[PDB]
Amino acid sequence: VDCTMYICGDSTECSNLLLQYGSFCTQLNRALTGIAVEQDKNTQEVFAQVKQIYKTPPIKDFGGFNFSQILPDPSKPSKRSPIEDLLFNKVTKFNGLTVLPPLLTDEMIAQYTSALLAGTITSGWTFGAGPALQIPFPMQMAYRFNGIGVTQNVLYENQKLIANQFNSAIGKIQDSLSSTPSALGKLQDVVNQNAQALNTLVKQLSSNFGAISSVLNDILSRLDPPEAEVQIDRLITGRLQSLQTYVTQQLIRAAEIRASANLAATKMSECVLGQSKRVDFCGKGYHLMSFPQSAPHGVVFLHVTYVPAQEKNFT
Amino acid sequence: IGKIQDSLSSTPSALGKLQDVVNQNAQALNTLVKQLSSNFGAISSVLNDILSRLDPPEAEVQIDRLITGRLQSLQTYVTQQLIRAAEIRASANLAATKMSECVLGQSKRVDFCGKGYHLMSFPQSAPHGVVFLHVTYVPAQEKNFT
Amino acid sequence: NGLTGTGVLTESNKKFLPFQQFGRDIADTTDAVRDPQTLEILDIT
Amino acid sequence: PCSFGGVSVITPGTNTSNQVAVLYQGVNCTEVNVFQTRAGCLIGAEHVNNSYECDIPIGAGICASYQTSQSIIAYTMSLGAENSVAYSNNSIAIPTNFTISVTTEILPVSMTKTS
Amino acid sequence: AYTNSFTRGVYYPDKVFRSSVLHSTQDLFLPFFSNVTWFHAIDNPVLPFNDGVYFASTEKSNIIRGWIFGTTLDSKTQSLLIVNNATNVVIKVCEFQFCNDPFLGVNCTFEYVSFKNLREFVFKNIDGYFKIYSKHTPINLVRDLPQGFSALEPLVDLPIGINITRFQTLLALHAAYYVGYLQPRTFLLKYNENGTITDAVDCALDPLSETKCTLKSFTVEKGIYQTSNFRVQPTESIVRFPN
């Protein structure tokens, strides 16, 4: 925001009479710079976990695992997954105020997420702490199954049925995400909150702030001294206390947003880069895989679970 | 160990986190001290000359503007110091968690303490801060096989 | 002038070169003024 | 109505040098060395084929640095080198040697008290 | 663009002994782009004026000897008219029978009765008094005066301010002029305890100085900063209002 002209209405009078107050909007701008730099620091922290870019081989022979629904589409002009495009499609300043563009853009965000997906699918968890080593997908799955506490031969003796189940599950989750209209609640809430905040901030100007008149251009240099100072100082109390609550509801909002970001970063580092033993951390049930996706101002996860379903009485 | 001694002796960019909070508190104190000297429309800022010459019809508004300006500025002294306390308390919670988990045992968590496979950890003291050393294991040379 | 109070007088060392009238400090107040009538530096805190 | 915007300054350290460039925010150069960009008007910067990572961030997906000696130039963001591996039904990699590393970490603990 | 009385031209607004502290003051000072040539009368006489000299070189004099002039080349205004006995002076807007051409021989108070020794002067007519400042060092070369960083230290004075004519710091002992190009803005000072200090700094030589004054510091660190918002110039109002 532009403090001096916003609060004085570009008045030379206001100018040479308001120098009594001091550095108020200077530290206001200090706080605004602080929150602005915090935003980009958070974004870089969450999405800067990988040092080298990788790429998948062009031949798609992965033993039945049709990862097309999550892989980027080279044919389309934008190299994004079909579910990413579905998310992007379902998801849909003048009197001294400004809006800044983000430092990072969707193109390199998509590049980062695609590189992460390719690296993890190609080399399992090996690349998380050293040089990537190639290893077959069924052998990686056997390692995961031995990790959970089941003998490996079970996977071999049922791999076809397991692949069929996995393909069916991927199709069904695609159907569920296409059908689900209530998933975007938090992001919609944040956007609507910001919109309403700025709306009431701008609409504040039209009020008198208790003024015994309303014409802005004519009176306030028909008669400056005690009707100016009072109108503009109840205007500045109104303005800098709605911005006291503006800045500070924005900082507590950024505090909860940064707690969310910290938990998201931990989720990345544990569930996505490897396999976690903590119960009911990376979703409910048993945790095997992890697939991240991109969203406007948000991130989307995917999980793979193992569940038993047919017991029998025994002695 | 030798190379980490040399690296810490050489690079001076580590202490920025502590310097930030130190300068933040110093700046806040300087601002609140400075804001006293203004007049806020009063004819004078020295109270003795005030009550000697100009009474409190406008010294009552000068004390009103003083008390309200310090309402914002000292409620915000405690308010940004309070959000700072929230941040430092989250930091202290995280520090205690790291203490207990990665110093009193061995963590299986991925990249929770350093990069690689953690083996050892030793804490070191800093003014209003703490220092950790992580010893990890990294594979070096690879070969192809079938 | 116009300062009075109860306390222990303190010595001074502040120097003074070619152009002054009265002592003034940084803090927008008065802290140490050389004696106007004796031309001797005197600081009282 | 007419627009407005902040005037931004990009500079290296004082002891390093004293040459300085200027950045205009949100303005259009057609409506005001010249380097027309999406962000605005730049002086001393050029579309340079070689790229580096971000050193002094400016915004809008572009970063500038004191570069060719060193001068204030603008370059597009660079992430890192690319790589790929050979995955086959009968392929495997294995390590043979190791190494030891030491890393550090810093965290704040508290703050001073006043009255 | 610097050719000196050096970054003097910062006179001392009062005797308040600020010491080793930052403070920027807005006062009456002098603008940019002061150039001049050398001519004939069909190499620096009286300058474009105010009280002394400009901003970068070195010297030490023992030169000046004589005078018959007015400081504004008028002598109706305050001339360098020495009927001033060095303890009592005369300065005459005091109306006497003026000769349009001066001469030389073989009420207007100082006691109170009718310069590379860089003693500044006083004809700042805030309700009519008279006085002098004082500092010292000389001219044997192109321009000079010396370096430091602050105003000096207070002992005895009676200050009201200056109106003489040749922008300052002055020229004396221990054709047309030439001066340089100086930007007028606030001036930061640092009065060390021992008092070995002369200089200041300006704010709008360039965006470098803009940051220097905006951050209220000197050692500008590597980074990016934003100064005062540049309002896009509204040369004229808008044709939208009715009649």
E-chain residues within 8 Å CB-CB of C28? Answer: none
Chain E nearest C-alpha distance from D10 (Å): 5
> Can you read off the two tokens belonging to residue C23?
């002592």
Q: Are A112 and D79 in contact (CB under 8 A)?
A: yes
Q: How far is D34 from chain A (nearest CA, A)?
A: 22
Query: CB under 8 Å, gap of 24 or more: what pairs does B27-35 form?
Result: B28/B77, B28/B80, B28/B81, B29/D114, B31/A23, B31/A27, B31/B73, B32/B73, B32/B74, B32/B77, B34/A22, B34/A23, B35/A22, B35/A23, B35/B69, B35/B73
Q: Which residue has the tokens 């663009």?
A: E1
B83/A251 touch (CB, cutoff 8 Å), yes or no: yes
Beta-carbon contacts of residue D50 (< 8 Å; ≥ 6 apart): D75
Q: Quote the CA–CA distance of A290 and A272 in Å, as a whole number.
A: 5
Crossing angle for the helix pair A185-203 and A225-267, to the nearest 10 degrees: 170
Distance, in Å, from the CA atom of A6 to the CA atom of A24, rounded to the nearest integer, reads: 13
Give the distance from residue A8's alpha carbon to the nearest chain D alpha carbon, in angstroms.
Answer: 17
Tell me if E238 and D1 make a contact (CB, 8 A cut-off): yes
Backbone region of residue A259 per phi and psi (left: phi > 0; alpha: psi in -120 to 50; beta: other values): alpha
CB D20, CB D46: distance < 8 Å:
no
D76 C-beta neighbours (distance < 10 Å), count: 13
Are E197 and E151 a contacting pair, CB within 8 Å?
Answer: yes
User: Chain B partners of D113 at a C-beta cutoff of 8 Å?
Assistant: none
Instruction: Indicate the residue type of D3.
Output: S
CA separation for the pair D14, E105 (Å, rounded): 58
Chain D contact partners (≥3 CB pairs within 8 A): A, B, E
Which residues, 6+ apart, have CB-to-CB distance to A221 below 8 Å? Answer: A11, A13
* Distance from the first to the final alpha carbon of chain B: 38
Q: Based on the number of CB atoms within 10 Å of its own CB, is C7 exposed (0-12), middle (13-18) or buried (19 or more)? A: exposed
Task: Annotate A60-69 with b (16+ C-beta within 10 A) or e (fewer).
Answer: eeeeebeeee
E12: chain C residues, CB-CB within 8 Å: 19
A69 contacts: CB under 8 Å, gap ≥ 6: A81, A82, A83, A170, A174
CA distance B54 to E208: 45
Query: Residue A235 phi/psi, 5° resolution?
Result: -70, -40
Distance from CA of residue D52 to its chain's centroid?
8
Cβ C18–E17 below 8 Å, yes or no? no
Tell me if D9 and E238 make a contact (CB, 8 A cut-off): no
Cβ distance E169 to E7 under 8 Å?
no
Chains B and A touch (3+ CB pairs under 8 A): yes
CA-based nearest distance E227→chain D, Å: 6
Is there a contact between A286 and A308 (Cβ–Cβ < 8 Å)?
Answer: no
Angle between helices A225-267 and A24-46 (to 10 degrees): 20
CA distances from D49 to A278, D39, D52, E84 (A): 48, 19, 10, 74
Segment A101-106 long-range contacts (CB within 8 Å, at least 24 positions apart): A101/D59, A101/D60, A102/A40, A102/A43, A103/A40, A103/A43, A103/D57, A103/D59, A103/D60, A103/D61, A104/A40, A104/A43, A104/A44, A104/A47, A104/D61, A105/D61, A106/A294
CA E157 to chain centre: 18
What residues contact A299, with CB distance under 8 A and at least 6 apart?
A46, A264, A292, A293
Helix (H), strand (E) counts: chain A: 11, 2
| Alpha-carbon separation of residue E179 from E69, E143, E202 (angstroms) | 21, 9, 18
**CA–CA distances in Å: residue E86 to residues B13, E81, E89, E109, E166:** 62, 12, 7, 11, 21
Contacts of B12 in chain D (CB under 8 A): none
Taking CB atoms and an 8 Å cutoff, what residues of chain D touch E231? 4
Inter-helix orientation angle B16-35/B60-103, to 10°: 170
CA separation (Å) from D37 to D20, D31, D76? Answer: 18, 14, 11
Tell me if E158 sits within 8 A of C21, measured CB to CB.
yes
Answer whether B85 touches D (CB < 8 Å).
yes
What are chain C's partners, defined as 3 or more CB pairs within 8 angstroms? E
What is the C-alpha separation between A262 and E167, in angstroms, rounded? 62
Q: Look up residue B69 and give its DSSP letter.
A: H
Give the C-alpha distances (Å, rounded to integers) separating B59 from A21, A22, A235, B55, E49.
16, 19, 22, 6, 46
Spatial separation of the C-alpha atoms in residues A159 and A141, rounded to whole Å: 10
Q: What angle do CA E134, E140, E145 make, to 5 degrees?
A: 40
Separation of alpha carbons A262 and A256, rounded Å? 10
Calpha distance B67→B61 (Å, rounded): 10
Q: What is the DSSP annotation of B73-111?
A: HHHHHHHHHHHHHHHHHHHHHHHHHHHHHHHSS---STT
Distance to chain D for B17, nearest Cα, Å: 7
Experiment type: cryo-EM
Query: Between chains, do E157 and C25 touch, taking CB under 8 Å as contact?
Result: no
**Which phi and psi angles does D54 have, rounded to 5°?**
-75, 130
CA atoms within 13 A on the CB side of D9: 25
- Cβ of B134 within 8 Å of Cβ of D103? The answer is yes
C-alpha span between E132 and E123 (Å, rounded): 9
